[PDB]
CSV table of C-alpha atoms in Angstrom, one decimal:
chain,number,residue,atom,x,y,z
T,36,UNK,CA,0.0,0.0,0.0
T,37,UNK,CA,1.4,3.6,-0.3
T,38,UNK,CA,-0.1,4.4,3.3
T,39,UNK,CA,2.7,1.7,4.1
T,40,UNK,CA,5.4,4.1,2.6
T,41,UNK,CA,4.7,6.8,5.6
T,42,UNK,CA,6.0,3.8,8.3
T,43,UNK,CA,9.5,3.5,7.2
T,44,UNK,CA,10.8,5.1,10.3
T,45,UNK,CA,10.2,7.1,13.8
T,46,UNK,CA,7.0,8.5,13.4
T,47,UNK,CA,5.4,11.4,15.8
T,48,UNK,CA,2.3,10.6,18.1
T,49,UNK,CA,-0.3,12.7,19.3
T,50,UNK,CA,-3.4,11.3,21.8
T,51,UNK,CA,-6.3,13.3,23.0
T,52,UNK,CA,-8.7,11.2,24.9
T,53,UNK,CA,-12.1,12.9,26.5
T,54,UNK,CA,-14.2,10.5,28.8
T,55,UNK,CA,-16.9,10.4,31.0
T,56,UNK,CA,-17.0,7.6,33.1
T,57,UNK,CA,-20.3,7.4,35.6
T,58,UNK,CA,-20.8,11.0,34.9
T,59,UNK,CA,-17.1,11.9,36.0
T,60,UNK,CA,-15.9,13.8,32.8
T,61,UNK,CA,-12.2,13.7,32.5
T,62,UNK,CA,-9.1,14.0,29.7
T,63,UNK,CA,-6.0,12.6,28.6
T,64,UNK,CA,-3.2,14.0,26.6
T,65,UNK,CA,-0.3,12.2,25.5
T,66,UNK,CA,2.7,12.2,23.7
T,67,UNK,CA,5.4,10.2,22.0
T,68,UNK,CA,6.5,8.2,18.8
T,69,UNK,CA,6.3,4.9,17.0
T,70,UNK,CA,7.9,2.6,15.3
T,71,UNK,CA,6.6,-0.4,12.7
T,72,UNK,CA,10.2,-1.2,11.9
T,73,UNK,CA,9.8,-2.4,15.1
T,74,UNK,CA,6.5,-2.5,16.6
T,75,UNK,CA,7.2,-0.1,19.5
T,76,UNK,CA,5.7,2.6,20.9
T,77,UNK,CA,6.7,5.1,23.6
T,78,UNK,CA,4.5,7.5,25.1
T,79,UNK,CA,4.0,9.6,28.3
T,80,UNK,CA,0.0,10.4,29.0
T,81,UNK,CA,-0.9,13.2,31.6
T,82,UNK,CA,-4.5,13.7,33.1
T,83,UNK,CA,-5.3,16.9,32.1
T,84,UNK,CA,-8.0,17.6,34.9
T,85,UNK,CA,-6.7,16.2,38.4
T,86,UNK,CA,-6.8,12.1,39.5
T,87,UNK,CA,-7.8,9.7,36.4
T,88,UNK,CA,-11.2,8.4,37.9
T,89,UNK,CA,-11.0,5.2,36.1
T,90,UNK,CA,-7.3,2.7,36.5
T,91,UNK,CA,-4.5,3.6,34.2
T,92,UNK,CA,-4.1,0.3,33.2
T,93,UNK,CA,-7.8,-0.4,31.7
T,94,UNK,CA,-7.3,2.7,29.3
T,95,UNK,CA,-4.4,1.1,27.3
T,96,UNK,CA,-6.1,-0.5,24.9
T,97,UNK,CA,-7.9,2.9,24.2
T,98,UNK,CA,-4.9,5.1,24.0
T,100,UNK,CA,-2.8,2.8,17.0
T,101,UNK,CA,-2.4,-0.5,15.3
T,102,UNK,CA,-0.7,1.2,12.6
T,103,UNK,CA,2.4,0.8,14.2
T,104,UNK,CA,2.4,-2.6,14.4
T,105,UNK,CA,4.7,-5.0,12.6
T,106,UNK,CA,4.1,-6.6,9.6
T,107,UNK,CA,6.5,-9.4,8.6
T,108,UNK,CA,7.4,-9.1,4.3
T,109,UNK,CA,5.3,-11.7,4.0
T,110,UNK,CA,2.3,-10.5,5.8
T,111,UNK,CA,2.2,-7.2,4.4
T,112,UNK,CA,-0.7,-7.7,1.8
T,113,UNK,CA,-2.6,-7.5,5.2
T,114,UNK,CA,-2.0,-4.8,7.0
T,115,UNK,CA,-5.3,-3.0,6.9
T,116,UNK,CA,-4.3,-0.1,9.3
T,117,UNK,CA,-1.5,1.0,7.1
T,118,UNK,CA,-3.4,0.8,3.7
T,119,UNK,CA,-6.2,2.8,5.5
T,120,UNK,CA,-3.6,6.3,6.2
T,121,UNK,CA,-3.0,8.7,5.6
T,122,UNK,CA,-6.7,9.5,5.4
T,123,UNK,CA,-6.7,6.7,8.4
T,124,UNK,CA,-9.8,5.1,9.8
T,125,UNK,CA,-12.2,5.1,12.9
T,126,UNK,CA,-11.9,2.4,15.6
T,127,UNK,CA,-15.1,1.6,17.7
T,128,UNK,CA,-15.1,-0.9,20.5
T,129,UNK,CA,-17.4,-1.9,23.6
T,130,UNK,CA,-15.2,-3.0,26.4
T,131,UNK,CA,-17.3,-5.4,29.0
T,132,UNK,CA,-15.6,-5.5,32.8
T,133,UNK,CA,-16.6,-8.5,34.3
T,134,UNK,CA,-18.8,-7.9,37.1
T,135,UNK,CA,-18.8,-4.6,36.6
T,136,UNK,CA,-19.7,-1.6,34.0
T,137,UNK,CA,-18.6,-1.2,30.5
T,138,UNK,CA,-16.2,1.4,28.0
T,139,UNK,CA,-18.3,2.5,24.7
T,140,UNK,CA,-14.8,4.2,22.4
T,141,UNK,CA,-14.9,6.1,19.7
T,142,UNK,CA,-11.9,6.9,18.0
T,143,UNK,CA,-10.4,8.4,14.9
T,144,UNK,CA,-6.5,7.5,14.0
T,145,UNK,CA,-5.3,9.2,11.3
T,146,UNK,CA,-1.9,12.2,9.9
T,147,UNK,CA,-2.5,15.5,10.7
T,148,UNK,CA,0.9,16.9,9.2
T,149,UNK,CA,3.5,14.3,10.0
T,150,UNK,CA,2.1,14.1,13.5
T,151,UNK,CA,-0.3,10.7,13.8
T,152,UNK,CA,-2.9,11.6,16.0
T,153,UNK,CA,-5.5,9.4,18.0
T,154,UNK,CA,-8.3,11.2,18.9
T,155,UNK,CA,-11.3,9.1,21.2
T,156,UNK,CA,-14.1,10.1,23.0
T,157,UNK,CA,-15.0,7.6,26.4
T,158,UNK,CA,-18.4,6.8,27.8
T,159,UNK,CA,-18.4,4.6,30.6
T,160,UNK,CA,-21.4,3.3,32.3
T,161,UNK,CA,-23.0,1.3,35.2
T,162,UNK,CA,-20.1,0.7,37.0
T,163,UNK,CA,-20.1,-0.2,40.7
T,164,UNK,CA,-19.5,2.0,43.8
T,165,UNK,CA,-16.5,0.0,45.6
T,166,UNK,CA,-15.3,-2.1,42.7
T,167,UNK,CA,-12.1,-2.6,40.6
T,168,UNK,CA,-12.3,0.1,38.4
T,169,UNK,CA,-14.2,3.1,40.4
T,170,UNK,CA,-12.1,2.1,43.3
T,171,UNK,CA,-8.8,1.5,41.7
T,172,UNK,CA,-8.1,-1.6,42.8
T,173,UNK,CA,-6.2,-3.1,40.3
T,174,UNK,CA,-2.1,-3.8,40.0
T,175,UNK,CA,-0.2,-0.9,37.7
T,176,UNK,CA,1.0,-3.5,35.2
T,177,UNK,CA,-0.2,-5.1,32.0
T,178,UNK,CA,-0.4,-8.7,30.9
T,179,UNK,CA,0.6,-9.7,27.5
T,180,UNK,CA,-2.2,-10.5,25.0
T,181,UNK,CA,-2.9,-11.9,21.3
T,182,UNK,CA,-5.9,-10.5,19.9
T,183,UNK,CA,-7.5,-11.6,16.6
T,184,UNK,CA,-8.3,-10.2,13.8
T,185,UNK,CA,-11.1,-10.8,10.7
T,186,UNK,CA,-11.9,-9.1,7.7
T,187,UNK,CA,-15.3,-7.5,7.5
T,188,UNK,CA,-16.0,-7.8,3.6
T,189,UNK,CA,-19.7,-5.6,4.2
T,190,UNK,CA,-18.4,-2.5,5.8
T,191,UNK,CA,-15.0,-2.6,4.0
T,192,UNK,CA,-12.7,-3.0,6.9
T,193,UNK,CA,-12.4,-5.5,9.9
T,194,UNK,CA,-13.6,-6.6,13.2
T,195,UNK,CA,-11.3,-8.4,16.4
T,196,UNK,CA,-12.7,-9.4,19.4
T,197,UNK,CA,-10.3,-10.5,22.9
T,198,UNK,CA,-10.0,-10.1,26.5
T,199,UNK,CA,-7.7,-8.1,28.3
T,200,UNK,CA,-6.7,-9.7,32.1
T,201,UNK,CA,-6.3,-7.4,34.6
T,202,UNK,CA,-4.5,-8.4,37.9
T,203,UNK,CA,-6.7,-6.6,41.1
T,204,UNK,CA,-4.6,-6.4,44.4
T,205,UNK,CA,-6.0,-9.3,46.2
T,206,UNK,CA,-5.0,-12.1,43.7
T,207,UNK,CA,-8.4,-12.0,41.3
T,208,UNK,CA,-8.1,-11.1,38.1
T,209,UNK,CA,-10.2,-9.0,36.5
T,210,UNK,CA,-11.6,-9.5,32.6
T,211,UNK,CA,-12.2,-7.1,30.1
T,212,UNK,CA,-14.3,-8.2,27.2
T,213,UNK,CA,-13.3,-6.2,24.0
T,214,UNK,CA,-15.6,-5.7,21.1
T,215,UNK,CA,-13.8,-4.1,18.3
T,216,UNK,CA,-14.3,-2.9,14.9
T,217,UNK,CA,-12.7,-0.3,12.4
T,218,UNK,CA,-14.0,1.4,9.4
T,219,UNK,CA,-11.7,3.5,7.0
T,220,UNK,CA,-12.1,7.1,6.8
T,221,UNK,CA,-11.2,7.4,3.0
T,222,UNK,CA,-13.0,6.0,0.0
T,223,UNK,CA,-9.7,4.6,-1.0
T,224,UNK,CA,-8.9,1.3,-1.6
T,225,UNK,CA,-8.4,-0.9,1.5
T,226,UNK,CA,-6.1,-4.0,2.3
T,227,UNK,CA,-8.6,-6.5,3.8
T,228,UNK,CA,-6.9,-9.2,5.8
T,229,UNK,CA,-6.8,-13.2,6.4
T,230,UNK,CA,-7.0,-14.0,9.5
T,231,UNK,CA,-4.4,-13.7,12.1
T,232,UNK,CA,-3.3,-12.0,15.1
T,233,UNK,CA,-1.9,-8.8,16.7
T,234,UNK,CA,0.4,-10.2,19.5
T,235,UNK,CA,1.3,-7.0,22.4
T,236,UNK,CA,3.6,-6.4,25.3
T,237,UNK,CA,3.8,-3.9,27.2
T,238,UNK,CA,5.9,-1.6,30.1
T,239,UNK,CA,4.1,0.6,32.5
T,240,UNK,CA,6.5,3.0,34.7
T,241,UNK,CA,6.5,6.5,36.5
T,242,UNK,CA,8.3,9.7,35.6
T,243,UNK,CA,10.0,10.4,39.4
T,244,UNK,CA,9.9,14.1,38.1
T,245,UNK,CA,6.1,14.0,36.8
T,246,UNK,CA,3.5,16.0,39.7
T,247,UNK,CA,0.7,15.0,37.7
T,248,UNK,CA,-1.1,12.0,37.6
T,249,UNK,CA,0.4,10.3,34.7
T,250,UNK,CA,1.2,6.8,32.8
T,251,UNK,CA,4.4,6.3,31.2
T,252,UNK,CA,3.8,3.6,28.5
T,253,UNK,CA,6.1,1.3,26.1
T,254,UNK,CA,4.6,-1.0,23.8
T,255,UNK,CA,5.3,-3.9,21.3
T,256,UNK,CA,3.0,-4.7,18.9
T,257,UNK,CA,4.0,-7.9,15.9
T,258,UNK,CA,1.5,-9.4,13.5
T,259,UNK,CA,1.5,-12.9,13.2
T,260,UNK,CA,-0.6,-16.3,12.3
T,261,UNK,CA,0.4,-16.5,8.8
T,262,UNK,CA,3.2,-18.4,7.5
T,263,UNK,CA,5.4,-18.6,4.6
């Protein structure tokens, strides 16, 4: 694809999350760059209006599958590439078990050279004293694979997965993700086999940071398809 063209090095990042979460409206910024050379990512995010009200660690997912890498021999199947610069929205309903649910909203696409991931958060009957509204769960993040599928009828593709958290006492706590994206061009599209996104990640502090804050780094490889 030629979107694949603008990946051949360090790319700039720009994320701009607004959320409301039981009413609680709050934002993120953050900042950094990516790699598909690679797969990584490395950001810093800030919350822009106090405390997060909602864990760091169930907002990852939320806060570009663009970067991720493509062996040569998968690359006839990377639909977030062939979808930029124009780039595409993401949508997904995330289900905590137990517990309320994320309805996301996003658009990921250049503005400039900067690529920029803009979502808006509704979260919704969650539970006084739980996980999530009382923060209960480990700052870390397990890795995942997550699978994705063509959707030949709205021109793009679909991935559904579960994200464990770890909570303090032991438990782990699920997180049901319902995904689909939809490009924002009327461009032609690479529309995948199926295979999988496979991610790790690193979550750490800034010791000079006041605000609340995540510092994030991120792998992200295709894979499922062999030679």
């Amino acid at each position: 694809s030629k979107g694949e063209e603008l990946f051949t090095g360090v790319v700039p990042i720009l994320v701009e999350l607004d959320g409301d979460v039981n009413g609680h409206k709050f934002s993120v910024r953050g900042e950094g760059e990516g790699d598909a050379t690679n797969g990584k990512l490395t950001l810093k995010f800030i919350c822009t209006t106090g405390k997060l009200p909602v864990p760091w660690p169930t907002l990852v997912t939320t806060l570009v599958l663009c970067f991720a890498r493509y062996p040569d021999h998968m690359k006839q199947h990377d639909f977030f590439k062939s979808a930029m610069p124009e780039g595409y929205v993401q949508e997904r309903t995330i289900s905590f078990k137990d517990d309320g649910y994320y309805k996301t909203r996003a658009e990921v696409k250049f503005e400039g050279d900067t690529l920029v991931n803009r979502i808006e958060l509704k979260g919704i009957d969650f539970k006084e004293d739980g996980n999530i509204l009382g923060h209960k769960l480990e700052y870390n993040m397990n890795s995942h694979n997550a699978y994705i599928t063509a959707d030949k009828q709205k021109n793009g593709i679909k991935s559904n997965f579960k994200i464990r958290h770890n909570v303090e006492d032991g438990s782990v706590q699920l997180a049901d993700h319902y995904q689909q994206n939809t490009p924002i061009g009327d461009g032609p599209v690479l529309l995948p086999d199926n295979h999988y996104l496979s991610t790790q990640n690193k979550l750490s502090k800034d010791p000079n940071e006041k605000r609340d804050h995540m510092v994030l780094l991120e792998f992200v490889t295709a894979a499922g398809i062999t030679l």
